[PDB]
Amino acid sequence: LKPWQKAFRQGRYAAAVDDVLNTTAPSYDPVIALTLLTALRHRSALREALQGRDELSVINILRWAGKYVADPRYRSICVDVAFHLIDLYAEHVGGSAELATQFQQLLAKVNREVEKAELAIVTGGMVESLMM
C-alpha cells in the first residue's frame, strides 16, 4: 500500500495530504495530488483541509503549489491553494523566516504567471506597430 492509502484507512487525514503531495516519494503521482486537491475544492473543503497544520506541512504544500503553478492543468488549483494559505497563515509568518520565504517564492511564481500573460497580450500591440 502507498503511504497515503494507509493514512486514509486510519484516521490520519492531515498525514494523507502530506503523503499525496510528497513529490520525492517513489510512488508519487502528480495526477493523484491534483485529483485530491480538486476533489476537496469540489466538496467545499479545500480550506478546511488546509487549516490547522504545522509549519512543515504548510511549507511542503506551498512548495507543491510552486512546482506546478506554471502548468496550465495544475495552475487553477495552485493559485487557489496559494490564496487559501495566505488567508490562513499570513499571521504566522512571524515566528518563521523559512515560511515567509516559501510564500514569497510561490507568490513570485504566481506573479510571473500574470506577467507572462501580460506579455502575450501586449506583444500583439508591439507586432502591430512594428509591421507598420
Add this chain to the structure above:
Amino acid sequence: LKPWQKAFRQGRYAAAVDDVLNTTAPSYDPVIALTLLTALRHRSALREALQGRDELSVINILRWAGKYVADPRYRSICVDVAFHLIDLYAEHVGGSAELATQFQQLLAKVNREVEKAELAIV
C-alpha cells in the same frame, strides 16, 4: 429544468455560458453563473465553452469576470477564465485594441489580487 441546465446536460456548453452570462435577463444570477462555470471546470469542459468565440463575446466575458474576481466566492473561476481566455485568444489581439484593452483590465485586477496577498505576508 432550466434552459442553461438542459444546454449543459445536452453538452451545449457554450450555449449554457451565453445563458448564464446574459446580465440583461430577469433571472441573471451570478451564483448560477458560478455554478455553471465551476461545473464545466469539473467536467474539464470550460476551455471548450470559451473557445471558438468572436471578438465581441470575448470582450464581454472578460468584462463579466472583472466584476466578480475580487470576491473570494468567484476569484478562482474568474482567474481561470482569464487564463483560459489568454491562452485561447491572446495571439489574435493584434489590431484589436478594444480586446487588448479588455484583456489588460482583467489582468490588472488579477494582479491586484496577487499584490494584496504579498501585502498580507508583509
